[PDB]
Symmetry: D2
Subunit: 180 residues, 4 copies
């Protein structure tokens, strides 16, 4: 039990390593261009994945990329799917166990020709098989509770890539939050 | 004594409906409906007591095919929302006594940026009414310190009824899509 | 041109019909259940979300600690797994009855947790499960229902709790001002 | 230039894990876990950048059988929560620079009323650290203006792992129940 802090932190370092290993410059560049070209971004993440979706929407919105975050399925998610536009981007955060509403949101968007992106735990997972853009992270926990550190690091990379691409837009939003 | 409370509560809400109907202006409803329909995106803000009304109005607009964001809290999320406003947005604030600052700040930030605004409020001369381009007023009187939202809710019922008659094909496409999403993806 | 009169007349009729269906015994038993609970969970989705939001706000503002859930799935399953016999589950559920609210009521009833339904029929799926049922009229002029009758029922519960426990209601105002 | 961003970003987060591990004190984690288990109810507050950390912590706690409310915005909802506090609650505030006042006021409000408080923060001398009974610090440095919650998330990972080992029976029952309800629905 006295080893539990070193085990936990060592494990999160391996999560970052497996994630860095599986990070592809081409996949990152294409995911970043899709985020920037969208007129509106929808991020869906439920259960364990909700915190990653909340982090990604905060980060996008903070950079001037208008984003809706949905952390529950049901009727609200169904009506969003019913109102999708070809200029939207649907990002699903979905890892094992794959909660069906997120996978269904990617499948519904894909069917309607709407660009899709999956932040997932395997390059052949159900959301990976559907989505146009796939980013993979390790999620291993020392016990049953998973760790979102690898998913959060992919979000950190995405935000850093956008901020370098469009610094004026990001600085402008920053000027308004600095005022509050 | 308190055996009279059901008659008092239900009669108070009937009187709120009568007073709200008496204050409704056809020109103002028509201008409010045209503003909602012309927007590329609608943001609805309501906090505390008003949050329920903002939730109902956003549910209604999204069901009719008008893409709508509902905010029931202020702060950094609202600041960032204001920072990202576009001239083709419509900001709807639901704000009644006591006027929680952040809903009024949401209307003010939109009006300062040249974004159309609308207030669903309790007086034609309240702080949000004085800021917004479009104003709709409802009676909110409760039998006690808990106000009643029935008046505000009836005004939203009227806006939803007016939009559904103007754009019934857009409303049906949503219903048809929701049915399709249940059939094909189990949603 | 006649839509404002039709919409407002329809909502007056929803209130009158809801008043006609209100049973003093049922209101009394429901207020006693809300006041007895250590914690209250209110579940309402889709059209019913606004009603759950209003009821949660009103109960919290009277000093009744309440959680509002307006979506199902994960948060709801975990909520059911953590339910205590001292909780009260209130489901706001009307036609078309979204499954997750009905499932929240069933899950609470199976676990021996007091339940209450705010619904549109004495024999609706949530009414058949719940210990306490309160029925409201929901007819809208269109295809889109009106929550006015359900909202009046909540106004009536709040009004009844406020008279029973006025010092707890005042204390919440006093804390809010102090804060 | 931009080709180095994956290495910069991922190295930055490894350094955050290393720096957070070094600042983690066993007596403070132990007292934090005992206070979370002793509470009859846990309230987690985290706004803006900190909202994701609050959401993760509330999920993890709830998933282990610790009944937790999560608030990611201030205003009237937070103010009414503060008005209804019990001595048996635990107030957890996730608050880092720029310290949004509503989270710091939630901690100040709870502490004034003698309600146990805990801060998940970025400095042992930050405004929320100076108010709270329990303080856990993590490194939050990002490669740019967007900070990184990786260090804070790893502190949460440690709290959840410590709770799971203390109360394994409760955690498994919630996991079974949760799996059984997901199977059902």
């Amino acid at each position: 039990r006295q080893q539990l802090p070193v085990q936990v932190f060592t494990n999160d370092i391996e999560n970052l390593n497996q994630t860095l290993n599986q990070t592809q410059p081409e996949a990152i560049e294409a995911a970043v261009e899709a985020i920037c070209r969208a007129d509106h971004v929808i991020v869906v993440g439920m259960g364990f994945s909700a915190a990653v979706a909340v982090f990604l929407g905060h980060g996008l919105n903070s950079l001037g990329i208008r984003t809706t975050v949905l952390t529950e399925g049901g009727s609200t998610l169904t009506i969003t799917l019913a109102n999708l536009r070809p200029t939207d981007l649907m990002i699903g955060v979905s890892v094992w166990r794959y909660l069906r509403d997120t996978v269904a949101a990617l499948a519904g968007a894909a069917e309607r020709g709407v660009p899709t992106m999956a932040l997932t735990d395997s390059s052949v997972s159900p959301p990976a098989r559907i989505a146009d853009h796939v980013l993979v992270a390790a999620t291993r926990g020392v016990g049953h509770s998973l760790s979102p550190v690898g998913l959060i690091a992919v979000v950190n990379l995405l935000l850093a890539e956008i901020a370098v691409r469009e610094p004026e837009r990001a600085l402008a939003v920053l000027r308004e939050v600095d005022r509050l």
